[PDB]
Design an enzyme around this catalytic site. Structure first.
Site, short mmCIF file in Angstrom:
data_model
loop_
_atom_site.label_atom_id
_atom_site.label_comp_id
_atom_site.label_asym_id
_atom_site.label_seq_id
_atom_site.Cartn_x
_atom_site.Cartn_y
_atom_site.Cartn_z
CD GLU A 33 40.76 50.50 30.78
OE1 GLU A 33 40.87 50.41 32.03
OE2 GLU A 33 40.70 49.52 30.01
CG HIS A 77 42.20 52.47 35.78
ND1 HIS A 77 43.16 51.56 36.18
CD2 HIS A 77 41.38 51.80 34.94
CE1 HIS A 77 42.93 50.40 35.60
NE2 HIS A 77 41.83 50.52 34.86
C1 LIG Z 1 41.52 44.87 34.66
C2 LIG Z 1 41.81 46.21 35.24
O1 LIG Z 1 41.59 47.38 34.43
C3 LIG Z 1 42.93 46.98 34.72
P1 LIG Z 1 43.59 46.87 33.11
O2 LIG Z 1 43.33 48.23 32.60
O3 LIG Z 1 44.98 46.65 33.45
O4 LIG Z 1 43.08 45.82 32.19
MN LIG Z 2 41.32 49.00 33.36
#
Ligand SMILES: C[C@@H]1O[C@@H]1P(=O)(O)O
Ligand SMILES: [Mn+2]
Ligand SMILES: C[C@@H]1O[C@@H]1P(=O)(O)O
Ligand SMILES: [Mn+2]
EC number: 2.5.1.-
Lengths: 133, 138
Positions: free
Chosen positions: A109, A66
Site C-alpha cells: 500500500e 499488507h
Molecule cells: C489500517 C490498516 O491498513 C488497513 P487499511 O488499509 O484497511 O486502512
Molecule cells: Mn493499510
C-alpha cells in the site's frame, strides 16, 4: 523491550525479476545481491528478498495482510500513473491509498494519511470503538 | 518518492486472542479496539490487526517471509525466556555465525513469522563484505 522495526523479508520465486520490481518500479536502493538474496534501502527500511522457487503461493491472494509505505498527497497521482504505466497488479477521512502486489502476491500500500488522521476519523465516525489514547 | 513505513496490517482469525498476543506478550501499546480491528504502537510502528473469517492460512508456514523488530543484546535472554514462559511458537533458527548477530524467530496465532534481532543493516553488510565472496556490493 522492542525498540523499532529492524527489517522486512519477502520470499520470492525469481530473485532477478523481484529485484527489477523493487529497484526499477518502487525506487528501492540495491545494497547487495547473490543468486538467492538481495538487500535494499526502501524509504529508510532494510528490505530483504530471499528466493524460494518451489513453495505454495496460492492462498496469499485471500489475506488482507499488507505493508503500507508513506507518500505525499502531492505524488499520489504521479505514483498511480507510474504503477499503471508499468502494468503493476493494482487492487481495487480514510485519506488516499493505492493497493498493489509484487510478483509473488505480497500486498503493498502507498498511503498519504497518518495514525492521527485515522484515530480522529474513528473518534468522530465510530465512537462505539474503544480508545486508549 | 517512498518516504518511509506507514503501517503493518495483519489479517487475524481471532482478533480477541491476537490482541492478547501483541499487547500482553510483545508489549505493543494498544490505541484502538473494535470487534473487527485493533491499532497499536509497537516500537514506534503503527501496527493494525484486521479480523478476517475463513481465509486459508496453511501455506504461510512454508514461506520465509517475515518482519524483524529490534531488541538490545542486553534483553536477548530475557526476551527468549519470556516467549518460552508464554509458550510462544518459537521456530528453529537458521545456522548463525557470530557476525550474523542474534535472532529469535516465532509466529503469532495465525502463523505470521516474526523476528527479534539485535543487529543493524550496517552489521550485516560489514559481516557479508568480509565473509561472502559470492556476493555483489553497491
Ligand atoms: C489500517 C490498516 O491498513 C488497513 P487499511 O488499509 O484497511 O486502512
Ligand atoms: Mn493499510
Ligand atoms: C536478512 C533476512 O531476514 C533474513 P535473516 O533473518 O535470515 O537474517
Ligand atoms: Mn530476518
Amino acid at each position: 523491550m522492542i525498540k523499532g522495526i529492524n527489517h522486512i523479508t519477502y520470499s520470492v520465486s525469481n530473485i532477478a525479476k523481484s529485484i527489477e520490481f523493487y529497484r526499477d518500479i518502487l525506487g528501492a536502493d540495491i545494497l547487495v545481491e547473490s543468486e538467492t538474496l538481495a538487500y535494499f534501502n526502501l524509504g529508510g527500511i532494510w528490505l530483504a528478498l530471499n528466493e524460494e522457487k518451489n513453495i505454495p503461493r496460492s492462498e496469499i491472494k485471500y489475506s488482507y495482510t499488507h505493508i503500507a509505505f508513506t507518500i505525499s498527497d502531492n505524488d499520489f497521482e504521479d505514483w498511480y500513473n507510474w504503477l499503471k504505466e508499468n502494468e503493476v497488479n493494482i487492487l481495487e477521512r480514510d485519506k488516499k491509498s493505492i493497493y498493489f502486489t509484487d510478483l509473488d502476491g505480497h500486498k503493498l500500500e502507498l498511503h498519504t494519511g497518518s495514525l492521527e488522521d485515522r484515530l480522529s476519523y474513528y473518534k468522530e465516525a465510530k465512537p462505539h470503538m474503544n480508545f486508549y489514547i
